[PDB]
Design a protein around this ligand. Structure first.
Ligand SMILES: [Zn+2]
Ligand SMILES: [Zn+2]
Length: 227
């Protein structure tokens, strides 16, 4: 869908604008969109105002359009105030593969069950239209990347949700490495994984009693919920 149709699809226009601020541009809703000076459109003027259809938060429609055009344009929208997701949120994960293995040995802190191994393999390539620099190379460092879950009821639920996030292209993105500063490289995208069975190697791994709770919250923040 066209960007302006996304905004209209998920908003109900307000006849008279309230006094409160648009928190995207921090101008009153009754005045022109604060991003009217750098955002052009066809069917959305600088005065148009609406509220999202599920959380009733209100914005200049032209600010919502500018927000949407700064992200990847997959037809989904996320409310900047309450983070409610409209449509199916997807991401810019490059092509690769995701392999799942299991073994009977226990992770530290999960002596009562076996272990799930997830192996992600993403090669280098050419950036697509959704990426920072379309048509330019991107690198991919340190693949295959191996990740571990306990093979209990909660870990198996995380596994199934990770498969959804993978299908929605949400696990990796192309950006700059927080570790090395390198730009235009494949990096993790907001869903943290355990890459060490033993946290003594790097400081991060198992045991970690809060990990499954925390990764479930990260999946949910990206619209990947138990439903
Ligand atoms: Zn605004
Ligand atoms: Zn909202």
């Amino acid at each position: 869908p066209e960007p302006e149709q996304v905004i209209k699809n998920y908003t109900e226009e307000l006849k008279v604008p309230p006094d409160e601020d648009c928190i995207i541009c921090m101008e009153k809703l009754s005045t022109a969109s604060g991003y009217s000076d750098v955002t052009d459109s066809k069917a959305i003027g600088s005065l148009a105002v609406g509220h999202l259809t599920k959380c009733s938060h209100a914005f200049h429609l032209l600010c919502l359009l500018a927000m949407y055009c700064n992200g990847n344009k997959d037809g989904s929208l996320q409310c900047p105030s309450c983070k409610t997701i409209y449509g199916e949120k997807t991401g810019t994960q490059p092509q690769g593969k995701m392999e799942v293995l299991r073994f009977q040995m226990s992770l530290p802190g999960h002596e009562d069950c076996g272990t799930i191994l997830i192996v992600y393999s993403i090669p280098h390539g050419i950036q697509g239209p959704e990426h920072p620099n379309p048509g330019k190379p991107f690198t991919a460092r340190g693949f295959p990347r191996q990740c571990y879950l306990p093979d209990n009821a909660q870990g198996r639920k995380v596994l199934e949700l990770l498969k959804v996030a993978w299908k929605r292209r949400l696990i990796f993105t192309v950006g700059t490495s927080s570790t090395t500063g390198e730009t235009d490289t494949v990096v993790w995208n907001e869903i943290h994984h355990k890459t060490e069975m033993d946290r003594n190697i790097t400081g991060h791994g198992y045991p970690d009693p809060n990990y499954l709770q925390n990764v479930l919250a990260e999946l949910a923040a990206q619209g990947v919920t138990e439903d």
